[model samples]
Target: SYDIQAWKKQCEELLNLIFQCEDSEPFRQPVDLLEYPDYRDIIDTPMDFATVRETLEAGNYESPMELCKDVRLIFSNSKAYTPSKRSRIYSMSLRLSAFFEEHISSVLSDYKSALRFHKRN
Candidate 1:
């Protein structure tokens, strides 16, 4: 569906923004001890195709937990706005979940890498 693509794009953009932020001193502070803000709390969340694509393509995963939360929220929220896109949204969510599980093999492994891989492929 059109909206599903739009949602994907929005997600991608968010990821891109996060990636860009990660390059700065603030984002590199130390993920293990840092407490990143929840993605849902942000204003004007992306809900379009281009943004989502950008987010995914950005490929930075400093906050897998946050990204997962946001993706899950995207799926849940997308359900209310576009039930017809549920299947696609759910699929994306599941894929992300799997990526999170697979890449985070060690409890101590950097989550950022996993998050990057989640969106990379």
Candidate 2:
């Protein structure tokens, strides 16, 4: 039982935070909804490598389940930039994607652990 309208409302709230531009107010989309510029560009630059680096350095990120929010933040920087830096950014994004892929694999790959056995129609 999901409320579609309520879900839309929630997504709008999050998008307002993520893609907000300078001139427009939150949730208003100020000028045009088509081009929602970066309102809060203040984010972890080089986030791709940083996330992986942190993962390797710390040897932990609470666990993949715990880092779902972090995964979003990591991929948030996916918006490519200047040509000079484009490839590098993509590389980082790829690394992060693979890391998460591995994390997920570890979860499902773990056998002998009785968990969800789908019983659906």
Candidate 3:
């Protein structure tokens, strides 16, 4: 299949129309684990760290509301873990919650910043 060529052509067209950028570190790419070297084996990381990074990195996003909404796309209900004894479980969630205010309520805000960001944009 000429999928790569198709993708290149699509990129070309989009670039022709593009706008200014606004960005973050949390680059995401789906890996073909089977076709490649055992990178996961070599580069394995702890789930808690990865999770925390994933949540906090979204801070680059302008709207705290959308950032809060953004998390569910990854941390969906389908995401499950050992729910009992690991104190690790409680630690990460609470820390992340602290990083984002109103995490337990209906609104999300960086609080320290967004109170200004709200008026600007």
Model 2 C-alpha lDDT per residue in residues 1-121, reported as the tens digit of each score: 2222232233234334333333212212122225535523433343333343345346464333434455454555453432344465445555555554554443423321322222222
Model 2 CA deviation exceeding 4 Å by range? 1-39, 42-63, 80-85, 108-121
Predicted candidate 3 versus true structure: per-residue lDDT over 59-121, tens digit per residue? 444443444454443233112322443545334444443433332232321242445554665
For residues 65-99, write the lDDT of model 1, one tens digit per residue. 54455444443443343335445544554454454
| C-alpha lDDT of residue 103 in model 2 | 44
Highest TM-score among the candidates is held by which one? 2
Q: Which runs of model 3 end up more than 4 angstroms from their true locations?
A: 1-63, 72-79, 102-121
Which is the better candidate, 1 or 3, if ranked by TM-score?
1
Task: Compute the lDDT of residue 88 as modeled in candidate 2.
Answer: 57
After aligning candidate 2 to the native by TM-score, how far in Å is the CA of 103 from where it should be? 3.2
User: For candidate 1, what is the lDDT?
Assistant: 0.40
Q: Which candidate number maximizes lDDT?
A: 1
- Candidate 1: stretches off by over 4 Å: 1-53, 56-61, 83-121
Worst 10 residues of 1 by lDDT: 24-33
| TM-score of each candidate structure, all chains considered together | 0.27, 0.32, 0.27
lDDT of 3: 0.34
Pairs of residues at least 3 apart in sequence or in different chains that clash in candidate 2: 20-39
